[PDB]
Symmetry: C3
Subunit: 242 residues, 3 copies
């Protein structure tokens, strides 16, 4: 991790966040998303799964629909209107490969993002705990999909689908232990992100008996505060840029 | 500077790709743990049946299974299980391997999992094998899988309740963080354990296997000493 | 950054294993020209024909063009043996036992003392995100050193008449973590420029500068990146394993 984080250059108006599961975006980047949509930038979400194995007391057939509805409400709190879920992937056993790359390249060509946001694909989390193979798989495939989306002859079936090549400008990896850049966040954007994250009610409920609002405030409080020392005292969300 | 591993575990499961991985990377620690009354079991993905140049794998596998079981017995390890249907040299990382590992984790309920180095390079700097990369990665992944009720739901159908192992210790890691001090009786048991891989070590040189074993482990223990307050020991990278 | 060590002169046979045409020329062309000038035997093995690499040519047109370019480029350097694998697809090369086996088969065929690969790390030397083709091929080539040396991994190779072979060393071109270099003289640089420029349609697709100019700039930049960490000598950097 860099000792001085640079400001993320702000030359983009369309953002596509690609993540494995509901909650990845809120934990990793929600306040930045809030800041971006407050400034009039368009943000869409692509989720590979519904996070249907992520609540110990809800079986997957119950949990998926619940978390989908929670993600859609969280999105609406930030003024994100386009939220799409892939089909046919299973929370916890997402496999990296050409199939996933192609499904993500499809989404990149559909949305024509200037910035793509992913979630930490490294072997370890920001904290140093071991990361999951779902995060590793989706982040890797997303990074790889950038060049795939831009190349006419890779996944030629996409052309038949009516989707012409598109080259995204950069990828920003949220929650990386090798963050290089940061996004400064104001108090209103923070408040909004707290509401967004708090909307994952049953999910947070599975991990704490505290009010959803309170856990969310604490969580995003930590995220932002622990950027400041590397960013000249400013609360912000750190990203690794590629 | 390596920290002494904490002593808050009574059951250990070691998960490795092949026979000899444990005896080369972790044997002296295992000996010390079982001497203290801790229960250790081994799970091996393959029988290392491609690892002896003058025995064909059909003959080799059974020879090395027997060598591994004897090595284990020298350290007081009685539970030794081998998976079926993986091939020495071409183990593939994926959910299938993760599931087999999570099964064993749920069966054994280990508080400590021991793995063998999954990094790109050996402790020495040399290029590591895809078997080791695959099994170590899958075992690290399997901790969360074993703990989650909904991942591999077929495990519940088998009567295997979710279980959360507390820590993973990676042996032979070039990024070690902890170590286990080893007394002389434990060093002796570990030498006998490695030497039980008689045909394996006999294929790599003409020295007697126990002499070779004494050399190899003497080196392993001494390499830890400069970073462990001069105590000889086995180094581990701790995950969790 | 450490000073780069001179690569030891202890080999006569080299096998370069890469994903695509141009990998060799971009990563290591001036070293190859230096080796062939010194009478070393160099062979190339290409997993694909880089048939998705030219944005106005569909793979069925681009495959044959790039193969001819790659043979022309090799000839500029006095590389005769250029092998292509079949049934991999440019852009979606999959890492695994099957690729390893194909590579081990080449290693046993050629008996190289030094294997040259292209950067398999997640990032290019520049920090830009590497491709899964490069990650896959480099990784499988590094793994194939042991596979080629082991009688029982891929037992079918024995039946094909390929006895085990242990290569000495792998040198990775274009690595962000280089350790050694090969000094390159003016003659070799000039030959490498001609070799890279032979990728005429490919380079013509990437920028609209004359390919000859473009080749000179790219390879000048390669040689100059190494010089300050190599006693001021122009060279090609490698990570040795
Ligand atoms: K997640
Ligand atoms: K092994
Ligand atoms: K390439």
């Amino acid at each position: 991790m860099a000792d001085t984080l640079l400001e993320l250059p702000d030359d983009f108006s369309r953002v596509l966040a690609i993540v494995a599961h509901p909650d990845d975006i809120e934990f990793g980047a929600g306040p930045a998303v809030a800041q971006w949509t407050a400034q009039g930038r368009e943000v869409a979400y692509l989720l590979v799964t519904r996070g249907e194995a992520g609540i110990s007391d809800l079986e997957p057939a119950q949990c998926g629909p619940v978390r989908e509805a929670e993600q859609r409400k969280a999105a609406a709190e930030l003024g994100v209107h386009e939220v799409d879920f892939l089909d046919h992937y299973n929370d916890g056993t997402i496999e990296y490969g050409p199939g996933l790359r192609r499904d993500l390249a499809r989404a990149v060509r559909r949305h024509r993002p200037e910035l793509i946001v992913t979630f930490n694909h490294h072997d370890t989390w920001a904290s140093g705990a071991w990361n999951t193979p779902d995060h590793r798989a989706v982040g890797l495939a997303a990074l790889d999909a950038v060049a795939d989306a831009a190349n006419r002859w890779i996944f030629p079936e996409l052309l038949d689908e009516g989707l012409e090549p598109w080259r995204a400008g950069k990828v920003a990896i949220a929650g990386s232990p090798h963050a290089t850049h940061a996004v400064a966040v104001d108090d209103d954007s923070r408040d909004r992100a707290v509401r967004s994250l708090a909307a994952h009610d049953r999910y947070l409920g599975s991990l704490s008996d505290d009010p959803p609002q309170e856990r969310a405030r604490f969580i995003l409080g930590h995220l932002l505060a622990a950027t400041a020392p590397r960013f000249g005292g400013r609360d912000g969300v750190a990203f690794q840029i590629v």
